[PDB]
Design a protein around this ligand. Sequence first.
Ligand SMILES: *[C@@H]1O[C@H](CO)[C@@H](O[C@@H]2O[C@H](CO)[C@@H](O)[C@H](O)[C@H]2NC(C)=O)[C@H](O)[C@H]1NC(C)=O
Ligand SMILES: *[C@@H]1O[C@H](CO)[C@@H](O)[C@H](O)[C@H]1NC(C)=O
Ligand SMILES: *[C@@H]1O[C@H](CO)[C@@H](O)[C@H](O)[C@H]1NC(C)=O
Lengths: 48, 48
Amino acid sequence: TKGTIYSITPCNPPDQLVVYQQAVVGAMLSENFTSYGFSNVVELPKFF
Amino acid sequence: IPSNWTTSVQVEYLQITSTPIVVDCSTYVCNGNVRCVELLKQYTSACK
Ligand SMILES: *[C@@H]1O[C@H](CO)[C@@H](O[C@@H]2O[C@H](CO)[C@@H](O)[C@H](O)[C@H]2NC(C)=O)[C@H](O)[C@H]1NC(C)=O
Ligand SMILES: *[C@@H]1O[C@H](CO)[C@@H](O)[C@H](O)[C@H]1NC(C)=O
Ligand SMILES: *[C@@H]1O[C@H](CO)[C@@H](O)[C@H](O)[C@H]1NC(C)=O
């Protein structure tokens, strides 16, 4: 119709998580959001 | 016997490290189809 264009991002990109002493702790993500019950999402270079 | 010398410089190069790569089995092959994931579910013995 007009000329606008749209990208198609995938729904669920893989997330990197960490475990220690047989429990999960911390998580490397892509979105500035607290997906799990973690109380803080420290923005860091190249990742959250 | 040798008398007073002159200086020179020689250059060498050594490989020291390789950029590591990591892969997600289920993303790579399934590509997000739940039924594909379920057919794969019986092969977790393999791709682990
Ligand atoms: C992570 O932090 C959250 C809150 O910051 C902890 O949550 C409490 O967990 C219990 C057990 O499920 C719930 O009954 C409470 O309602 C939760 N509180 C809130 C505010 O959601 C959680 O236990 C922490 N977990 C770890 C592993 O640190
Ligand atoms: C990330 O989330 C925090 C949470 O308060 C917010 O203050 C900040 O503006 C957000 N940044 C981006 C780039 O979304
Ligand atoms: C070596 O020594 C002699 C005498 O001191 C001098 O004439 C000559 O230039 C020197 N050579 C070098 C390469 O320094």
